[PDB]
């Protein structure tokens, strides 16, 4: 009745199996394409990603891998790579270094409480934080310099 690769009521449905760039499928007796395990799409040319792979930041060419776009990492490829060499900072988007309370700047390696951490004012001076690794030494009588050391 039906010729090779022709199926259906009046043999009007065409299907010839493929295992290439255009598809990874066999054919059923209704003339529909049955994707090979790990293949997706009406033509089975697209690969099924690792269960949980990020739709925007992760892609496929082999099942079930989850390769990453520059600036993204992890199994599910959902975590940003912070800017090198980010210390006390995190990211929302790639190459970001968002400091917490209290660090700066850019790499979040510069102290916002440099006075509390280091006590740079000597010989009875007063320290007050003025920014990332920045301080102010208010010196008593007989003492000068950036740390009241002269």
């Amino acid at each position, epitope marked *: 009745t039906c010729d090779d690769y022709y199926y259906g009521f009046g043999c009007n449905k065409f299907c010839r*199996p493929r295992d*290439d*760039f255009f598809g990874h499928y*066999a054919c059923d007796q209704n003339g529909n394409k*049955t994707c*090979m395990e*790990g293949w997706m799409g009406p033509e089975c040319n697209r690969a099924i990603c690792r269960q949980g792979c990020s739709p925007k930041h992760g892609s496929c060419k082999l099942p079930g891998d989850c390769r990453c776009q520059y600036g993204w990492q992890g199994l599910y490829c959902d975590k940003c790579i912070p800017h090198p060499g980010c210390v006390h900072g995190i990211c929302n988007e790639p190459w970001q270094c968002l400091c917490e309370t209290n660090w700066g700047g850019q790499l979040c390696d510069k102290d916002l409480n440099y006075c509390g951490t280091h006590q740079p004012c000597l010989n009875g001076g007063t320290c007050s934080n003025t920014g990332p690794d920045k301080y102010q030494c208010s010196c008593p009588e007989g003492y000068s310099g950036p740390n009241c050391e002269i």
Partner: antibody
Amino acid sequence: EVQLVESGGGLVQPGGSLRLSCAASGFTFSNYGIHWVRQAPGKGLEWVGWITPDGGYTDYADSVKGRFTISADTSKNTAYLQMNSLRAEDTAVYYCARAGTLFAYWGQGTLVTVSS
Amino acid sequence: DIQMTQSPSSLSASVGDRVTITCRASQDVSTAVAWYQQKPGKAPKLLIYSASFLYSGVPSRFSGSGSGTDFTLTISSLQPEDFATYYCQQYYTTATTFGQGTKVEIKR
């Protein structure tokens, strides 16, 4: 893990016949397919042909067409290659590879030597 | 009946050398190109697929580039265990075609 083992290869008289088996394991056999790639001594890789276990479809290279027949058995998880009218040109290491994997999984290969 | 042509046929390089093997397709085959490493007496081992995608477990020193008709394989820093016959392959059609091969020898 995915395992493909080729058996059957040996000395065959020219014009003779030989059947090779590709014993697959570690995956759902019906979900993929099997390809056959041969490599003549000191020569490159040559795709002999392929089979869908689901449906029973076959395709061959023009070099092996008519003489070579590829078959399968989902219940044994084995694909076969019946070689007939064996020419000297057929002397090669015959490998079987899983379909739908961009040729990531190959077997160790079996040696078919066509000689009097 | 697409043809895959590799260049060079053979090459000798020292450890740490950048090795470049080229492959030309007779027709346009998009990114449907794979690269393999074959040690004599062993089955070919997949290195690169989709012309530029590194297969799992393959050292990062192996990379691939190309789209259309010209494809290249790169071994950034050659190692002593990298001696083999390398093959490019097209899977634009189910009846896959392979390049003749490129032998890589290690100088010392």
